[PDB]
Amino acid sequence: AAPGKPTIAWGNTKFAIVEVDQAATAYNNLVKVKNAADVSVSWNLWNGDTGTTAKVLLNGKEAWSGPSTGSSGTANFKVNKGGRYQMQVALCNADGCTASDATEIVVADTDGSHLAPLKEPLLEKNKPYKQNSGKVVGSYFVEWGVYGRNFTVDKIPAQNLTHLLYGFIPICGGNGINDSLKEIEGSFQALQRSCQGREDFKVSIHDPFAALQKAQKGVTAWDDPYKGNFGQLMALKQAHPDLKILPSIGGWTLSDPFFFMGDKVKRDRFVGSVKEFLQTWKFFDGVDIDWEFPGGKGANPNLGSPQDGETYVLLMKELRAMLDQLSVETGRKYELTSAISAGKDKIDKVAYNVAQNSMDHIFLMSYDFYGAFDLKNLGHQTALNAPAWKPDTAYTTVNGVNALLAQGVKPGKIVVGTAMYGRGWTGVNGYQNNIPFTGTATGPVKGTWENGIVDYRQIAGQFMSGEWQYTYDATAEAPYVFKPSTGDLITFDDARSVQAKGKYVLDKQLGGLFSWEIDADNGDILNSMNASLGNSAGV
Template sequence: MLLRLKSLIILMLIVSLMPAGSIGQSATPGKYKVIGYVGGFRGLVAAEQIDVQKLTHIMYAFVNVKDSLAVLTNLATDSTNFRKLNLLKLKNPDLKIIISIGGWAWSENFSDAVLTETSRQAFARSAVEIVRQYNLDGVDIDWEYPGMPGEEGNVYRPEDKQNFTLMFKSCREELDKLAAETGKKYELATAVGGSQSFIDHTEMGVLEKYLDFINIMTYDYGGKNGTVGHHTNLYAYGDFEDVSSADRSVRNFIAAGVPPHKIGLGAAFYGKGWQAESAVNNGLGQKRVKTVQGGGYTKLKDTVINQNGNVRYFDKKAKAPYLFNAATHTLISYDDEKSIKAKCKYVKKHKLAGIFFWEYFNDPKGYLLGQIDKSL
């Protein structure tokens, strides 16, 4: 009896010493990562609106690459954003805040930045210095794309394949040096294209050992050969067994040597739209005429779905919703609660690291994050 009483007193003492807000407010329960990209490149982030208790990671997008260095493009807003995001740890002490370097618009200088050992070390040091200075938790690299053209004007070369790997080696070494100084663990991650061509131009089975997790951008797919299709479908659809899908991307990366427990599955908190040449099959598989506006999920759910002729359909084979307007032949592809639930089930079934999404404020009402929280 006395032993039980002593144990109870010790337990009460430990609880009393825990930071305010930590009880019942830790990261999403369980072993899965829930990673939200937040667009700091737009300016000040409304950090107070982030439902931080449902997240394990915030990826701060983006840090630029200039003169072989990782560079904060707007120091005033970036530094303010880091301070506000760090304050969220009062609500969720387990939260990780990680800088994401590159992205679609800021990947043009990666190839030059990592071309030599000297430049790679300089790049890695500059990235980790941002982590050190602002008391952050790691580095994420979003190079679009090594060895391949991304945005028009991007520099790319065959040597990117090996230098992509060596870049992560340098970053890992610098993060480990910082960890030795602070006693804190720092994470290294990457966001990767979901195509087989991305795998062919990299050494995923080699570089994965330097990384804590790898987020496969299982969105922005679209149809084959200029046709209208799903952009964030979980499985293949129609008569195309070889069409792009999250499942196909995951299987290809595993075959390339990436362990399933390091893979993050991507969800799109936004829609993409096209006008189809024909209304046959609700536009799916038809020739694209032009791109049309998609919009964030909150806007879609509140003002577009099943309104003004935009009828919602659900492709059972693809596990993906879409809108089709028979009058205008426009199709909008997106993720909703039903497809998010299916993706979370997939994460569990295949023992993946978790789920990530672009971008938090595309769904400010939290419809999809709420579904993730329920499903994982």
């Protein structure tokens, strides 16, 4: 007679190919990449002959075999592909095999293959669009927005994007290497702890709790190996396999290490660590380089060199060569992008006409033209054109685009930026002919989260009523709200100015639109980005 039917023992059924150490703060100890997950199964036979060979089947296919030597047994084996498997134990003898009932096991991998898709409803005023225009529609999600801003990955209107950028992946380094971090409370120290035992100029994760361990929708079970932003982004990938999810390296306070990369020893180490990062976190589709800025004038007044333009071009070439190698190793397409200043003085420090051949998209940061960092010279922070009262205005979207085009940049490489936030001053005074920008300011506007900056959501909800004037400058293509009693002035993007930007992209055959930052929108801005680029409504 064939053996009796085995009973699978109660036990852990969740295993991981990339293991996360739950009691570690250093990136080196936090994640362990393996070739395969170590899986274990046990069984009991309560009735009959135990057979002579015991087998573990995954979807009917043997993953382990051994002699059946007792009424209880244990099998330890490796599984090298993520997913969910119907696991059975079978006991075989010459008269037949008898298989247990199936027990599902989970083999986790960083592509999210073990995760149910994160298909969440659109919130606030977001409306569904199809990504059928062929244009880029991108936005940055910020790692730290899961705290005070309470904006998690399940709130991303993901179907309305082609590109989702994750700000920011840091570059390891202490004194002299990340000094700009020291201006943010605890930020420098958090990176040093993450980078303990890790060489300078390798990438890491700045807030491993937010990125990997904070409970979030769809990743709340204690033995879910990936939680936080990364876990949710994995599940988001499962729901939207065509979404490009790019890690962004740099930003305003994490850009200092780029300035040392004229040393090819450091550059090589950085490029190698980006490759390892992408082999580790398989849901990511490439890399975004947010170096602010080649040549200086970033957060750090002690950094910036005329060599930076050559360093940038070399970095883009070597990153592309690494990504090409990754691409043919995996059969995937990987993208290389960069967020760049839109000011002509900064643009002409770099030969983008050369670098463009390595790059899929240039995210032109056509915003922060004006703000509370300058209380004397006011203007539209993100306008398309110069205003009528100052047609020679240096800092406009068109002037940044024109600088790139004059270098020889192909128009299709250029993605125009929109702002999901306003910048603002207080105490504006001494202006002429009812144009508050011709005056001067006494300080920053009170901000949503920091001085001088207001979420678009708060502008729409709070500063579009009462005493606030509203004006759409049709020459600049830029709205602004003004409270005369206090001199509060805010410059921002709205649905109409975004529409002008989208129409401009289509007319000049540019690459699309991207935005900073996705948590601050109520839907109006992203809706207009999709509509103005010719994306069809619907799902």
